[PDB]
């Protein structure tokens, strides 16, 4: 009973079984500071059975440095009591409670236990009980720019899925008697040594089709070995191999034993000596806190740093750690001991929430065991960081001033950012900016733009929106929510509802872009990303790109004059199945789904568009006759949908649906089998229907079958919607009507002047004149996946399953059909939190104005295997132009609105280059091969006038510049790249 209308995006990552098992697990959370509340929010959105909180400490002002559910009116009230009320409204299926006191036996009521902001002795006491009773125990800690995560799921943890990937499957070319299995041509299985696979539909070796998993020995990118198959057979032809994933047993250790002999997880191999240092540092920190009544070292205090270093030395000697302590790093940890950042809190909260989901669902490979992370490169260097500057001022920003100081806080308060999109990533970015106090100064400002509206499925990962807000614009709701969270942002945020594109340049013009400080992207398509990247390159503004895909995520930073732009990078393309495979010879369910989508478009969308356009354009027929590829098809569609097959009731719609069923699932198959019989052979003698090609078989219409009836109902409903009729779903009428249907005879045909125009004219004149039909319009069917009351996905599933039954392929349910056809991108809340944390950690680097390229880090991570990696950005390529160093991306030519001839002369005299091609937008303004008459007509005109003449459209008043792409050859004719031209109107 999983509400797939709410967890639609998450189920594509986890699955039905994972959520079914997850809806029976209890989670306890000790500590309700920023990290604790973030973890609680993520878990509540995840959908666990219930969440319990325990943090009885009174609220203080500085706690608001990273808490977004606390207001200044909550001083003196326990954090849990004031947080449960706001947490209970995130999800209606997840009750949230509060417990005043914690008892050891009470811990047996929970399935997972998360511990934050607790002393080491209490952690040991809890772990000593939660280890021997088989309870997952996750301890998290965030100190300034450092973070520690510890996981313990018992000594007999069972991990069903270790990577989260789909099982690998493939086709076989030939199998030798020595177990040599060969893939098809240029086909890579991707298996690894030690994997288990099973073979089916193997011809010549039936024994391998039993299903017993077998070991895998990788012998090459295209072949592997299984051993000896002497007994089973001699040689095998064709077949399919499928990988089998077996559960694994992972054994952890208790905290007390792992303190002596830990097991680190290295998040980066460039700094491998740090985790051993941090392991001692955090224990020494806990000891110092215990030695000062729970008082952490004061910010940037030398004496506290010395005392902490002495404690570190004592602990290192005690534990027989043969490691020399790094004084500088340890003292830096001491200085930031009281730090509390919202970016690190969000990052660690997302990570720990993912770990909790792993623990509850027994899926994916978890951390084993310690995970120490630091982003010490984010420490500002352009401001004075000292004890005086980092002391608290009794304000809500103490947790951040204690790390960065007041001057950098003032620098942040005057930012002028621009956030594109208000999705999940947009919501997290806005939350982080609100917590940090971004643009809370006099000169600060925030702009958020997004044209989409909130839907029900967006509530799973967008915590700023409530069910009462379904159907409204995202920007307004987000702005209101962040004004409620931080009252200081009242009037400092402007929310637009404009799509960021070529048509919105009248609003996001020069005035708008000349006051910004940085642009942050929260988009989900590549085209808009490229558009924003081009705009940022033109205006030379820092850009922050972030992308997610399931549990994987990546973040990239683009800095002017330092690093290359996003466009230089490229994502993998999309594999479009060859038209031959889709049209005639499918062999997978994806082919059938694609065929069904194309059929839907051709049956319910294109003909209606043609009919509507015929009755609107007074000269449609003449234009189509000499422009459209298949005028005959358009004429036939218009005739059929206007006069020949215009329904007058729902019964005629049912009859038409039956006829289309017969046409597409019973007749074309007969034609194909008549052209290529099942016993036909290729030119080389091989059987035709072998390997990737599967012999089809015609279907006979049986009303009692569920799939046939579903297809009939869906087709009839869609036809009625197209013709604006009243549809029905009672099976009685369908069974009554379809009984009296006489199938027209059909026999496959073997085949064996300029009158075609005459036939087309005869068809055309048969159509009623447009004047006769005034106000008669047919409703086209626009595909909408999220709506479950339009029979779209139902029809697609029916068609795909029927075509699969034609070719003996495994049918798929409505869930996978919706996943594939709708191009739904899997998404998770934890990945969003992590990417937001990384982007906000890069943002403080950008604010500080760091110049070196090694201080920035593009980040990539995969939460399925706990993989994190950070690499330096790729430097922008340089080039030699006219014996000078030219940046390929961030350099341009600034010229007035001179004539084209003057521009050519300038490039000939200044750069010593001969211009050969000059373009702007999608037009070729000037080329070296154009007829001399055209050039002589175009040369004495200005660039603006030339563009106006060529594009046949006047330049808008808001336009103030032109971007020209120029390709020129040198004196010897050798082509040399040059930067674009920025003509100033």
């Amino acid at each position: 009973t999983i509400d797939e209308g709410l967890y639609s995006r998450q189920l594509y990552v986890l699955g039905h079984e994972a959520m079914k098992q997850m809806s029976q697990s209890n989670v306890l959370i000790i500590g309700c500071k920023g990290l604790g509340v973030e973890i609680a929010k993520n878990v509540c959105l995840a959908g666990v059975k219930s969440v319990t909180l325990y943090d009885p400490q009174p609220t203080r002002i500085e706690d608001l440095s990273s808490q977004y559910f606390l207001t200044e009116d909550d001083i003196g009230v326990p954090r849990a009591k004031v947080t449960v009320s706001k947490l209970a409204e995130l999800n209606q299926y997840v009750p949230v409670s509060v417990v005043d006191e914690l008892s050891t036996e009470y811990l047996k009521n929970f399935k997972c236990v998360v511990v934050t902001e607790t002393s080491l002795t209490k952690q040991l006491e809890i772990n000593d009980f939660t280890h021997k009773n088989h309870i997952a125990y996750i301890a998290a800690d965030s100190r300034g720019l450092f973070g520690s995560i510890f996981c313990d799921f018992g000594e007999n943890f069972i991990c069903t899925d270790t990577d989260g990937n789909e099982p690998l499957t493939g086709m076989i070319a030939s199998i030798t008697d020595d177990g040599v299995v060969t893939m098809l041509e240029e086909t890579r299985h991707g298996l690894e040594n030690g994997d288990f696979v099973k073979f089916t539909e193997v011809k010549g070796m039936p024994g391998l089709n039993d299903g017993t998993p077998r070991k895998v020995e990788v012998k090459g990118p295209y072949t592997f070995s299984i051993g000896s198959v002497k007994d089973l057979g001699s040689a095998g032809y064709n077949g399919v191999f499928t990988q089998v994933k077996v559960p694994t047993k992972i054994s952890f250790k208790s905290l007390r034993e792992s303190l002596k002999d830990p097991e680190y997880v290295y998040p980066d191999f460039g700094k491998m000596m740090r985790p051993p240092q941090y392991h001692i540092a955090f224990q020494a920190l806990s000891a110092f806190a215990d030695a000062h009544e729970g008082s952490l070292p004061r910010p940037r205090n030398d004496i506290d740093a010395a005392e902490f270093f002495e404690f570190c030395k004592k602990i290192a000697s005690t534990l027989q750690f043969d490691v020399e302590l790094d004084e500088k790093l340890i003292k830096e940890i001491s200085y930031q001991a009281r730090g509390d950042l919202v970016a690190m809190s969000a990052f660690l909260g997302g990570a720990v929430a993912q770990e909790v989901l792993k623990a509850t669902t027994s899926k994916f490979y978890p951390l084993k065991q310690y995970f120490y992370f630091d982003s010490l490169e984010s420490l500002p260097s352009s401001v004075t960081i000292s004890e005086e500057t980092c002391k608290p001022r009794g304000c809500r920003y103490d947790g951040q001033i204690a790390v960065f100081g007041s001057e950098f806080q003032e620098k942040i308060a005057s930012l002028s950012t621009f956030l594109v999109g208000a999705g999940a990533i947009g919501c997290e970015m806005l939350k982080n900016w609100a917590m940090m106090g971004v643009a809370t100064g006099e000169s600060g400002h925030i702009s958020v733009t997004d044209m989409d509206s909130i839907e029900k499925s967006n509530l799973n990962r967008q915590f700023l929106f409530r069910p009462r807000d379904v159907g409204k614009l995202k920007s307004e709701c987000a702005s209101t929510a962040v004004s409620i969270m931080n009252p200081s942002l009242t009037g400092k945020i402007t929310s637009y509802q404009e799509r960021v594109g070529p048509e919105s340049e009248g609003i996001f013009g020069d005035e708008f872009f000349e006051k910004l400080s940085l642009v942050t992207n929260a988009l989900d398509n590549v085209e808009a990303r490229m558009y924003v990247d081009r705009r940022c390159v033109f205006f030379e503004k820092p850009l922050l790109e972030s992308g997610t895909l399931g549990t994987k995520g990546n973040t990239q930073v683009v800095v002017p004059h330092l690093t290359e732009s996003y466009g230089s990078s490229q994502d993998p393309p999309e594999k479009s199945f060859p038209i031959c495979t889709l049209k005639n010879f499918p062999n997978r369910i994806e082919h059938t789904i694609a065929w069904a989508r194309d059929l839907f478009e051709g049956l319910f969308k294109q003909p209606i568009d043609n009919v509507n356009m015929y009755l609107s354009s007074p000269n449609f027929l003449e234009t189509s006759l000499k422009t459209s590829s298949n005028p005959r098809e358009v004429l036939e569609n218009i005739r059929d949908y206007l006069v020949t097959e215009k329904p007058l009731s729902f019964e005629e719609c049912i009859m038409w649906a039956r006829l289309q069923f017969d046409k597409f699932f019973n007749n074309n198959i007969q034609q194909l089998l008549f052209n290529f019989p099942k016993d036909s052979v290729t030119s080389t003698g091989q059987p035709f229907w072998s390997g990737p090609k599967r012999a089809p078989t015609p279907l006979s219409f049986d009303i009692h079958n569920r799939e046939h009836f579903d297809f009939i109902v869906a087709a009839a409903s869609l036809y009625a919607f197209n013709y604006g009729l009243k549809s029905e779903t009672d099976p009685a009428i369908y069974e009554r009507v379809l009984a009296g249907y006489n199938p027209p005879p059909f026999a496959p045909k073997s085949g064996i002047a300029n009158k075609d125009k005459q036939e087309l004219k005869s068809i055309a004149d048969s159509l009623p004149p447009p004047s006769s039909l005034v106000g008669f319009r047919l409703t086209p069917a626009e595909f909408e996946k999220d709506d479950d009351s339009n029979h779209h996905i139902d029809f697609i599933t029916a068609a795909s399953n029927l075509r699969a039954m034609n070719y003996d392929i495994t049918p798929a349910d409505r869930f996978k059909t919706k996943f594939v056809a709708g191009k739904i991108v899997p998404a998770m809340c934890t990945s969003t939190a992590v990417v937001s944390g990384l982007v906000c950690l890069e943002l403080v680097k950008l604010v500080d104005g760091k110049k070196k390229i090694e201080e920035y880090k593009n980040g990539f991570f995969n939460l399925a295997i706990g993989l994190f990696t950070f690499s330096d950005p790729i430097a922008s390529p340089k080039m030699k132009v006219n014996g000078k160093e030219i940046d390929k991306i961030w350099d341009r030519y600034n010229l007035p609105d001179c004539t084209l001839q003057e521009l050519i002369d300038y490039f000939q005299k200044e750069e010593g280059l001969e211009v050969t091609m000059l373009s702007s937008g999608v037009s070729l303004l000037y080329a070296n091969f154009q007829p001399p008459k055209k050039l002589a007509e175009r040369l004495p005109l200005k660039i603006s006038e030339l563009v106006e003449q060529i594009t046949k459209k006047k330049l808008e008043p808001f336009r103030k510049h032109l971007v020209l792409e120029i390709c020129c050859d040198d004196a010897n004719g050798e082509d040399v790249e040059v930067p674009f031209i920025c003509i100033k109107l």
């Binding site: 030798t176 060969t182 041509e185 090459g220 072949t223 032809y237």
Partner: protein, 75 residues
């Protein structure tokens, strides 16, 4: 020396080659005998696919070795 090339249907073709011969020459001989374009010939020996630009000796092919020939399928 002499070698045997097995096809997808179990046929065995005997070829006279030398350990120093290039893969290109062998593909040329197979095209001369069976008419299969070299671009579509995928020769495998001991679980390793022979690549253009090398010699038989590079793959440790010796007296009376056995190869397998599969054919690429055009789109």
């Amino acid at each position: 020396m002499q070698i045997f090339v097995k096809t997808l249907t179990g046929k065995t073709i005997t070829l006279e080659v030398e350990s120093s011969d290039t893969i290109d020459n062998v593909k040329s001989k197979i095209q001369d005998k069976e008419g299969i374009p070299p671009d579509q010939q995928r020769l495998i020996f001991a679980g390793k696919q022979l690549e253009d630009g090398r010699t038989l000796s590079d793959y440790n092919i010796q007296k009376e070795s056995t190869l397998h020939l599969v054919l690429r399928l055009r789109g």
